[PDB]
Amino acid sequence: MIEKLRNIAIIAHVDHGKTTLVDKLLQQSGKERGITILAKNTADYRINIVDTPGHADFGGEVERVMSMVDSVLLVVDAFDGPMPQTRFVTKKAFAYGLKPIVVINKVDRPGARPDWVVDQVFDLFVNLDATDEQLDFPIVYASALNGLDHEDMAEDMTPLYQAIVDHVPAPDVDLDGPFQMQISQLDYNSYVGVIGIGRIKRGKVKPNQQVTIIDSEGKTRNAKVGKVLGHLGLERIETDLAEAGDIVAITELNISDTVCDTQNVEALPALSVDEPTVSMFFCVNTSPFCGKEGKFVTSRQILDRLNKELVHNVALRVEETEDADAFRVSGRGELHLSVLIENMRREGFELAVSRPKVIFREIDGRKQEPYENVTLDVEEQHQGSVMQALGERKGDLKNMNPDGKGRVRLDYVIPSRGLIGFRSEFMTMTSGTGLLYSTFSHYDDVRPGEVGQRQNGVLISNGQGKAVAFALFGLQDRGKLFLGHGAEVYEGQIIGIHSRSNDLTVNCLTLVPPIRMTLEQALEFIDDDELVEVTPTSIRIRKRHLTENDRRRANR
């Protein structure tokens, strides 16, 4: 049963499908796909074959695919050869010691050239070390509708069979002991819940069987389970090990998230660089515009929506709270999350989100909060205020190579927790002639001393009427304003900033041009108490508490 298992993956050249071969090899029972096509054969070898995508999504997609398999397959046109659509995977394929299997496809073509293509699939195949292969054999020559070189050439359908059982081994994993499995792939359905798919590392799995989740500590229960056969994932009572076993009704559930039994077990590692860096709660809009401007409010629409992204987004991680109408969403970047928000924003979603709290994950002893490699380019007299603010952000400098044309380029290493806010007043210090983006680098020990705050606070309001020049031109002698003449806010909606740490509960009812604050500039601003309402039309900045005594209430 288990020593006849062979877990492989295929790489689609330009030409998509490979069936041909993917297909016809359903030849003993048993456009397009794809996962996982587990043929069945003896002259019984179950062979789960996971199709690595022709594309590359993002944030560590394909490396996660070969976390299941122990070897690979490479389809290459005999007319043409291998391409950049193959150079994407194969590189990451050899990263784990995966012995390849080369397939010269299309052999029957009149413009085909076998041993030249082989000679290309050597030279553009070794440059990336290995270092074996060598063999690398494999080295089959295969038609679709199915006399040169290997063999050749009987029922060019069984030769490939040899290759798999001969050179691909069975997954070295323990049948017995307490159950363990790491989720490799992920998908969702409009009334399943989340769905697993993976590779059984330890033990065996009963369909109605309690379990635990890992990286955190949830003890969610199991309900249903399913095997794969043909292009279908077909239900099964119970499955052992080493298979592409597909599973439901657990939770949330995530990519990389490990999960084993409940007795004597836990856990599973292997990130590797998929784990997120940032997080913020996603809440259904409870503020005074509940279904006004927008068209998706009921929590299980949002939930539904977030899950659907967790198929595409491999660099995303969504977990569910004690509170029903709220979800801690986390991703490998603040910019990677704002995508999800503003994309959802203009699908017509009314929801709100909490402040970007950093993922203070841990690597050996020190609680290593993440850092990033900043690059910023500014006019010279701005530099004084630029440098100044960053040495207060616990942002270490690396190099500042001056171009000598009236500008300077500055290059820092800054902590994530202290990058929150700066791209507002970088654009205010430089007055627009400051241009900066950046990139995530790695986590580092404590800053230390949490100093990623902002302050002062802002001006909170106390009525649902419209803002008037009779109140705003006076209230703006406390500080700058987020609204102008005429707009109906509510009790809670921060309509501006004070000049000092004071929060105020003012009246706009009884002018300077205001501040056009973006989605990003709202999130990367709010305090831990406050929240950002995001309708599909405008953007509001509420507090979570709406009045001047309701504020004083929660303060114990």
Site of interaction with ligand GDP (CB under 6 A): 15-20, 22, 31, 105-109, 143-145
In whole angstroms, what is the distance from residue 531 CA to residue 539 CA? 11
316/336 Cα distance (integer angstroms): 8
Residues 367, 378 contacting (CB under 8 angstroms): no
Is 521:534 a contact under the CB 8 Å cutoff? no
Q: For ligand GDP, which is the closer residue by CB, 17 or 479?
A: 17
Instruction: Tell me if 480 is assigned to a ligand binding site.
Output: no
- CA–CA separation, 135 and 123 (whole Å): 15
Q: How far apart are CA 245 and CA 540, in angstroms?
A: 46
Which DSSP category does 418 fall into? G
Q: How far is the CB of 12 from ligand GDP (least distance, A)?
A: 8
Give the Cα separation of 3 and 70 in Å (integer). 13
Least Å distance, CB 105 to ligand GDP, is: 5
Cβ proximity to ligand GDP, 18 vs 201, nearer residue: 18
How far is it, in rounded angstroms, from Cα 472 to Cα 426? 27
Shortest gap between Cβ of 406 and ligand GDP (angstroms)?
56
507 in a labelled binding site: no
Question: Shortest distance, CB of residue 20 to ligand GDP, whole angstroms?
Answer: 4
16 appears as a binding residue in the annotation = yes
Minimum gap (Å) between residue 159 Cβ and ligand GDP: 14
The distance from CA 482 to its chain's CA centroid, rounded to whole angstroms, is 33
Judge whether 537 is annotated as a binding position: no
CB-wise, 19 or 424, nearer to ligand GDP?
19
Q: Exposure pattern of 191-212 as b/e (b: 16+ CB <10 Å)?
A: eebbbbbbbbbbbbbebeeebb
Q: Which is nearer to ligand GDP, 146 or 298 (CB)?
A: 146
Is 15 annotated to bind a ligand? Reply is: yes
- Was 107 annotated as part of a binding site? yes
Residues 6+ apart with CB under 8 A from 292: 350, 535
Residue nearest to ligand GDP (CB): 17
Assess contact for 492 and 542: CB atoms under 8 A.
yes
Distance CA(331)–CA(294), nearest Å, equals 25
Is 510 annotated as ligand-binding? no
Residue whose structure tokens are 């307490």 = 178
Residue 55 or 109: the one with the smaller Cβ distance to ligand GDP is 109
Q: What is the dihedral of CA 58, 60, 61, 62, to 10 degrees?
A: 130
Cβ closer to ligand GDP: 72 or 107? 107
The answer to the question of whether 90 is labelled as a binding residue is no
Q: How far is the CB of 84 from ligand GDP (least distance, A)?
A: 18
Residues 6+ apart with CB under 8 A from 393: 414, 415, 418, 419, 422, 451, 452
Residue 148: CB minimum distance to ligand GDP, A: 13
91 is in an annotated binding site: no
Instruction: For residue 213, count other CB atoms closer than 10 A to its CB.
Output: 22
Q: What residues does 530 pair with on adjacent strands?
A: 543
Give whichever of 14 and 267 is closer to ligand GDP, judged by the CB atom. 14
Tell the smallest beta-carbon distance from residue 49 to ligand GDP (Å).
Answer: 13
Q: Is residue 19 marked as binding? A: yes
Task: Report the nearest approach of ligand GDP to the CB of residue 5 (Å).
Answer: 24
Q: Which two tokens stand for residue 384?
A: 């004084």
Q: Are 350 and 285 in contact (CB under 8 A)?
A: yes
Beta bridge partners of residue 407, listed in sequence order: 379
457 residue type, one letter: G
Helix 383-392 crosses helix 422-429 at what angle (to 10 degrees)?
Answer: 160
Binding site: which residues?
15-20, 105-108
Binding site for GTP: which residues?
15-20, 105-108
